[PDB]
Design an enzyme around this catalytic site. Structure first.
Site, PDB file in Angstrom:
ATOM      1  N   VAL A  27      19.893  36.863 -62.373  1.00  0.00           N
ATOM      2  CA  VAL A  27      20.005  36.828 -60.921  1.00  0.00           C
ATOM      3  C   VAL A  27      19.257  38.003 -60.308  1.00  0.00           C
ATOM      4  O   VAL A  27      19.648  38.497 -59.243  1.00  0.00           O
ATOM      5  CB  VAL A  27      21.476  36.917 -60.429  1.00  0.00           C
ATOM      6  CG1 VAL A  27      22.195  35.622 -60.666  1.00  0.00           C
ATOM      7  CG2 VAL A  27      22.179  38.057 -61.122  1.00  0.00           C
ATOM      8  N   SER A  29      15.784  41.273 -60.798  1.00  0.00           N
ATOM      9  CA  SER A  29      14.789  42.042 -61.542  1.00  0.00           C
ATOM     10  C   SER A  29      14.058  43.015 -60.618  1.00  0.00           C
ATOM     11  O   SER A  29      13.906  42.767 -59.422  1.00  0.00           O
ATOM     12  CB  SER A  29      13.739  41.118 -62.203  1.00  0.00           C
ATOM     13  OG  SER A  29      14.101  40.774 -63.528  1.00  0.00           O
ATOM     14  N   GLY A  30      13.590  44.112 -61.203  1.00  0.00           N
ATOM     15  CA  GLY A  30      12.857  45.124 -60.468  1.00  0.00           C
ATOM     16  C   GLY A  30      12.318  46.087 -61.510  1.00  0.00           C
ATOM     17  O   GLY A  30      12.043  45.681 -62.647  1.00  0.00           O
ATOM     18  N   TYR A  32      13.975  49.140 -62.173  1.00  0.00           N
ATOM     19  CA  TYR A  32      15.223  49.659 -62.747  1.00  0.00           C
ATOM     20  C   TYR A  32      15.680  48.857 -63.966  1.00  0.00           C
ATOM     21  O   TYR A  32      16.195  49.419 -64.941  1.00  0.00           O
ATOM     22  CB  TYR A  32      16.324  49.608 -61.694  1.00  0.00           C
ATOM     23  CG  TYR A  32      16.635  48.194 -61.250  1.00  0.00           C
ATOM     24  CD1 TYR A  32      17.599  47.418 -61.914  1.00  0.00           C
ATOM     25  CD2 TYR A  32      15.957  47.623 -60.170  1.00  0.00           C
ATOM     26  CE1 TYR A  32      17.881  46.116 -61.504  1.00  0.00           C
ATOM     27  CE2 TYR A  32      16.230  46.322 -59.760  1.00  0.00           C
ATOM     28  CZ  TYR A  32      17.192  45.579 -60.423  1.00  0.00           C
ATOM     29  OH  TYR A  32      17.488  44.311 -59.973  1.00  0.00           O
ATOM     30  N   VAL A  35      19.264  42.215 -63.839  1.00  0.00           N
ATOM     31  CA  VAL A  35      20.682  41.922 -63.711  1.00  0.00           C
ATOM     32  C   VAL A  35      20.954  40.475 -64.117  1.00  0.00           C
ATOM     33  O   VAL A  35      20.124  39.600 -63.883  1.00  0.00           O
ATOM     34  CB  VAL A  35      21.160  42.080 -62.239  1.00  0.00           C
ATOM     35  CG1 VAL A  35      22.591  41.614 -62.101  1.00  0.00           C
ATOM     36  CG2 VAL A  35      21.038  43.524 -61.785  1.00  0.00           C
ATOM     37  N   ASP A 165      23.812  51.122 -55.174  1.00  0.00           N
ATOM     38  CA  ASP A 165      22.659  51.939 -55.434  1.00  0.00           C
ATOM     39  C   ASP A 165      22.851  53.412 -55.454  1.00  0.00           C
ATOM     40  O   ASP A 165      22.538  54.136 -54.515  1.00  0.00           O
ATOM     41  CB  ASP A 165      21.511  51.591 -54.510  1.00  0.00           C
ATOM     42  CG  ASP A 165      20.702  50.452 -55.046  1.00  0.00           C
ATOM     43  OD1 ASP A 165      19.498  50.374 -54.727  1.00  0.00           O
ATOM     44  OD2 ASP A 165      21.286  49.637 -55.796  1.00  0.00           O
TER      45      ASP A 165
HETATM   46  C1  LIG Z   1      24.240  37.612 -57.393  1.00  0.00           C
HETATM   47  C2  LIG Z   1      24.093  38.932 -57.342  1.00  0.00           C
HETATM   48  N1  LIG Z   1      25.404  39.606 -57.691  1.00  0.00           N
HETATM   49  C3  LIG Z   1      25.729  40.969 -57.812  1.00  0.00           C
HETATM   50  N2  LIG Z   1      27.032  41.380 -57.893  1.00  0.00           N
HETATM   51  C4  LIG Z   1      27.231  42.743 -58.012  1.00  0.00           C
HETATM   52  C5  LIG Z   1      26.190  43.710 -58.048  1.00  0.00           C
HETATM   53  C6  LIG Z   1      24.860  43.205 -57.959  1.00  0.00           C
HETATM   54  C7  LIG Z   1      23.659  44.128 -57.966  1.00  0.00           C
HETATM   55  C8  LIG Z   1      23.327  45.181 -58.933  1.00  0.00           C
HETATM   56  C9  LIG Z   1      24.083  45.590 -60.153  1.00  0.00           C
HETATM   57  C10 LIG Z   1      24.374  44.644 -61.225  1.00  0.00           C
HETATM   58  C11 LIG Z   1      25.092  45.027 -62.383  1.00  0.00           C
HETATM   59  C12 LIG Z   1      25.543  46.374 -62.502  1.00  0.00           C
HETATM   60  C13 LIG Z   1      25.270  47.358 -61.441  1.00  0.00           C
HETATM   61  C14 LIG Z   1      25.746  48.813 -61.556  1.00  0.00           C
HETATM   62  F1  LIG Z   1      26.666  48.871 -62.479  1.00  0.00           F
HETATM   63  F2  LIG Z   1      24.720  49.536 -61.900  1.00  0.00           F
HETATM   64  F3  LIG Z   1      26.259  49.280 -60.432  1.00  0.00           F
HETATM   65  C15 LIG Z   1      24.533  46.929 -60.278  1.00  0.00           C
HETATM   66  N3  LIG Z   1      22.168  45.770 -58.545  1.00  0.00           N
HETATM   67  C16 LIG Z   1      21.811  45.114 -57.412  1.00  0.00           C
HETATM   68  C17 LIG Z   1      20.482  45.513 -56.601  1.00  0.00           C
HETATM   69  C18 LIG Z   1      20.644  46.337 -55.258  1.00  0.00           C
HETATM   70  C19 LIG Z   1      19.288  46.697 -54.580  1.00  0.00           C
HETATM   71  N4  LIG Z   1      18.342  47.375 -55.537  1.00  0.00           N
HETATM   72  C20 LIG Z   1      18.144  46.623 -56.835  1.00  0.00           C
HETATM   73  C21 LIG Z   1      19.495  46.297 -57.540  1.00  0.00           C
HETATM   74  N5  LIG Z   1      22.655  44.111 -57.006  1.00  0.00           N
HETATM   75  C22 LIG Z   1      22.560  43.215 -55.826  1.00  0.00           C
HETATM   76  N6  LIG Z   1      24.675  41.836 -57.843  1.00  0.00           N
HETATM   77  C23 LIG Z   1      23.526  39.458 -55.959  1.00  0.00           C
HETATM   78  C24 LIG Z   1      22.096  39.545 -55.714  1.00  0.00           C
HETATM   79  C25 LIG Z   1      21.581  40.019 -54.454  1.00  0.00           C
HETATM   80  C26 LIG Z   1      22.485  40.418 -53.411  1.00  0.00           C
HETATM   81  C27 LIG Z   1      23.901  40.348 -53.615  1.00  0.00           C
HETATM   82  C28 LIG Z   1      24.415  39.873 -54.868  1.00  0.00           C
END
Ligand SMILES: C[C@H](Nc1nccc(-c2c(-c3cccc(C(F)(F)F)c3)nc(C3CCNCC3)n2C)n1)c1ccccc1
Length: 348
Positions: A27, A29-30, A32, A35, A165
């Site tokens: 769901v 990519s970048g 970093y 995910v 973030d």
């Molecule tokens: C569907 C998707 N769901 C979701 N749920 C929770 C966290 C995230 C997430 C993580 C993420 C995922 C797993 C672990 C962690 C950490 F543990 F590091 F905190 C963070 N990183 C990001 C982005 C933010 C902007 N910059 C790039 C990364 N999102 C949206 N995504 C979704 C996609 C887009 C918008 C909302 C939801």
């Protein structure tokens, strides 16, 4: 008793995770990393899993990865991203090289809400409140987000919000150039490096965000740095003498004094029809001098949030020792410090 793992191709890499997590689907990519959303059979919860790319490739990288894991482990608040689990396939420091981070699964971010919504002054009150509630907790531990934007603010179906973030790599010079959303929410003091910024830089961002939800339009859509500074000083007026001193950057300070002087505009005539309290709050947030800008804790008690404010349910964070930020270590040492943080993790 380390769980048994299983591998599988995904987001152009070989994900190796514990069997509890099932149905891995990409769901995102970048730079970093990538995910994946998945199903946690142990807890019955849907989750997001981020696999870090190049975790310990350079010293700056190794320290970054340690900073994120440290920030993520500290966070224990409803409006801040929580760490549900952190793991690595490795069985010893020697093999250690991958790092996975697990958090609840969220549906969309603030840009994905405005698109299919009609934000009412109540919704706006609710979303900003939550953000300020989370910032209060963040700042109480001397942690500064530094890059608040709608893309790192997550919202679940119920309009419940989390701040995301933490400790992500710095944005390249090219990534902040032109007509880009990556620069529209930054406080001028860091947009042009006037001085050593402080935590109120985040408040400025909240102001930019709040206005966007009230008007449906980007507050400062600068086409580049200079253009953006102009849009900003047009609304809030040019710097006074007190501010001019505070700006260390001799050149930046010199540049400003070249702009024709202008007065703060009337916000009630800028945000037509908005609740005067929102307007009052906005004038408190969008102040150029970061020393006089309203703080999060102070904003929570603003009359605009009376419907949601509650002194006894707006917690502060435990002390956060970040002395490591002024430490010089080798890649191996930042790595090792990381590994201790992984294995010493206690699930909530
Ligand atoms: C569907 C998707 N769901 C979701 N749920 C929770 C966290 C995230 C997430 C993580 C993420 C995922 C797993 C672990 C962690 C950490 F543990 F590091 F905190 C963070 N990183 C990001 C982005 C933010 C902007 N910059 C790039 C990364 N999102 C949206 N995504 C979704 C996609 C887009 C918008 C909302 C939801």
């Amino acid at each position: 008793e380390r769980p048994t793992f299983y591998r599988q191709e995904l987001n152009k890499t070989i994900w190796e995770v514990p069997e509890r997590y099932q149905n891995l689907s990409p769901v995102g990519s970048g730079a970093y990393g990538s995910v994946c959303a998945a199903f946690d059979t142990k807890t019955g919860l849907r989750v997001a899993v981020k696999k870090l790319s190049r975790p310990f490739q350079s010293i700056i990288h190794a320290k970054r990865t340690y900073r994120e894991l440290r920030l993520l482990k500290h966070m224990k608040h409803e409006n801040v991203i929580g760490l549900l689990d952190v793991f690595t396939p490795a069985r010893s420091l020697e093999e250690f090289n991958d790092v996975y981070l697990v958090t609840h699964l969220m549906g969309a971010d603030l840009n994905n809400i405005v698109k299919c919504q009609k934000l009412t002054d109540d919704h706006v009150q609710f979303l900003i409140y939550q953000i300020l509630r989370g910032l209060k907790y963040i700042h109480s531990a001397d942690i500064i987000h530094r890059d608040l934007k709608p893309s790192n603010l997550a919202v679940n179906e119920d309009c419940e919000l989390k701040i995301l973030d933490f400790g992500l790599a710095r944005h390249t010079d090219d990534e902040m150039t032109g007509y880009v959303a990556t620069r529209w929410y930054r406080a001028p003091e860091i947009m042009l490096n006037w001085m050593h910024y402080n935590q109120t830089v985040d408040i400025w961002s909240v102001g930019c965000i709040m206005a966007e939800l009230l008007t449906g339009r980007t507050l400062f859509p600068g086409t580049d740095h200079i253009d953006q500074l102009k849009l900003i000083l047009r609304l809030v007026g040019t710097p006074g003498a007190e501010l001019l001193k505070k700006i260390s950057s001799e050149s930046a300070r010199n540049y400003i004094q070249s702009l024709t002087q202008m007065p703060k505009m009337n916000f009630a005539n800028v945000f037509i029809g908005a609740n005067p309290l929102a307007v009052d709050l906005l004038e408190k947030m969008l102040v150029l001098d970061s020393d006089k800008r309203i703080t999060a804790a102070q904003a929570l008690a603003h009359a605009y949030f009376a419907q949601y404010h509650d002194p006894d349910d707006e917690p502060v964070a435990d002390p956060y020792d970040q002395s490591f930020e002024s430490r010089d270590l080798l890649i191996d040492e930042w790595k090792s410090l990381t590994y201790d943080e992984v294995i010493s993790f206690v699930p909530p």
